[PDB]
Structures are given as C-alpha cells and as structure tokens.
A paper describes a structure:
Due to its frequent mutations in multiple lethal cancers, [name] is one of the most‐studied anticancer targets nowadays. RAS proteins act as molecular switches alternating between an active, GTP‐bound state and an inactive, GDP‐bound state. For oncogenic RAS mutants, however, the GAP activity is impaired or greatly reduced, resulting in permanent activation, which is the basis of oncogenic RAS signaling. Mutation G12C in [name] was recently identified to be potentially druggable by allele‐specific covalent inhibitors targeting the Cys12 side chain in vicinity to an inducible allosteric pocket, called the switch‐II pocket (also known as pocket 2).8 Occupation of this pocket with a covalently bound inhibitor results in a protein locked in an inactive GDP‐bound state.
Numbering used by the authors: 0 to 169
C-alpha cells in the first residue's frame, strides 16, 4: 500500500525552504524561486520500501497570521525547522517558529527535524555543535543539508517521515 504525509517547511526568508522543497519534488537545485510564493507540493517517493506520498507546504508570505497557512499548519503531521549555516539570525529565529507550531498544534509532541541548510558554503557562522545542542534541547533530530548539492535532502524529509511513523505508533 502507501501512506500520505502532510509536511511543513518553516524558517526565515532566504534559508532555502523553496530550494529544499524543489530538490525533493524535482531532484535539482533551483537557485531563483519567487521568495513570495507559498504553496503545497506533492511528490510520490519510496521510504524504507513503502510508497510514500509527501504533501509539503513551502512557507513564505509574511510573519503575520495567514488563515490558509494556519489551517494547513494545524493539520501538519511534521515540520522541518530550517536555518542557514551562514546566517546566525536564521538560527536564532528557530525558537520563534517552533513556539508558533506548539501554539497552533494542541501538543508539545509534534514531529520536527532541525535542518541546517547551505552546508556547501565556506562562510559558516553556526557551528554544527550549536545546532546539535538546540535539537537535543527540543528532543528532535538534526540534519545538515545542501539544497545546492542535494547533500542530506532525502535524509531531512525521510527522517521527518520516520519521526511521524514513531509518533503515530503512540
Ligand atoms: C523570503 C520570505 C520568506 O521565506 N519568509 C518571510 C516570512 C517567513 C516565515 N517563515 C515561516 O516559517 C513562518 C511560519 C509561520 C507559522 C505559522 C503557523 C504555525 F503553526 C507555525 C509557524 F511556524 C508563520 C509565519 C512564517 C513566516 C518566511
Ligand atoms: N549555496 C547554497 N545556496 C542555497 C542553498 N539553498 C538555497 N540557496 C540559495 O539561497 C537563496 C534563498 O533560497 P530560497 O529557496 O528562495 O529560500 P526561501 O526563502 O527559504 O524559500 C537563493 O539564492 C538560493 O539559490 C544551499 O543549500 N546552498
Ligand atoms: Mg521560498
């Protein structure tokens, strides 16, 4: 058979939410994608031998409340918390996005994965160990990605699916 998963990608403007999503759905690096476009994208993949349909909300728009976004967030099964390893502000912004997920879900038990994107860049400002400290504090996995090289992209999304499977067993 197959399982559907409703996934959400959150993070600061410019961290690579769209680039990561397009790497999953189309398998290449799209370096210019309208920063204002918020949409959901469907892709059929196979995860641990099971046909898996991923619906992925690629967040954009504004920081303020959007009704359609909120109603999608409320029913999201798993969230990727994306920062860029060369942007300390995007890392500091993770707390903000995680709080909004907990506020909109009725749960302190929401599948999430912390994603350090742009791992290909030499201009790192956030140490892997700092990200590991934070993911540990949340009790969630940390995955390093490059939407440019596709390094870690399947690991980020498939790890989130594995976290949802574990949550559904409870
Ligand atoms: C380049 C522009 C861009 O990508 N952004 C501008 C606003 C930024 C933004 N990112 C988010 O991830 C986000 C998430 C939420 C939200 C809503 C509901 C919920 F349960 C959790 C959330 F994290 C609201 C606003 C934004 C704004 C991205
Ligand atoms: N070098 C590098 N650039 C990236 C990576 N991911 C995204 N980008 C670039 O970072 C910018 C923002 O990407 P985008 O997907 O629009 O970010 P979003 O605002 O979070 O949707 C664009 O110029 C992308 O080309 C990456 O992993 N490595
Ligand atoms: Mg985008």
């Amino acid at each position: 058979g197959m399982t559907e998963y409703k996934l959400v990608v959150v993070g600061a403007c410019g961290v690579g939410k769209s680039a990561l999503t397009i790497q999953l759905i189309q398998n290449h690096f799209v370096d210019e994608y309208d920063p204002t476009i918020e949409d959901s994208y469907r892709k059929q993949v196979v995860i641990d031998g099971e046909t898996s349909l991923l619906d992925i909300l690629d967040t954009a728009g504004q920081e303020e409340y959007s009704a359609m976004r909120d109603q999608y967030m409320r029913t999201g099964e798993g969230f990727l918390l994306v920062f860029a390893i060369n942007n300390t502000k995007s890392f500091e912004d993770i707390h903000h996005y995680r709080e909004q997920i907990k506020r909109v879900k009725d749960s302190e038990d929401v599948p999430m994965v912390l994603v350090g994107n742009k791992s290909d860049l030499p201009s790192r400002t956030v140490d892997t160990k700092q990200a590991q400290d934070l993911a540990r504090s949340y009790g969630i996995p940390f995955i390093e990605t490059s939407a440019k090289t596709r390094q870690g992209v399947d690991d980020a999304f498939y790890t989130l699916v594995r976290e949802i499977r574990k949550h559904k067993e409870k």
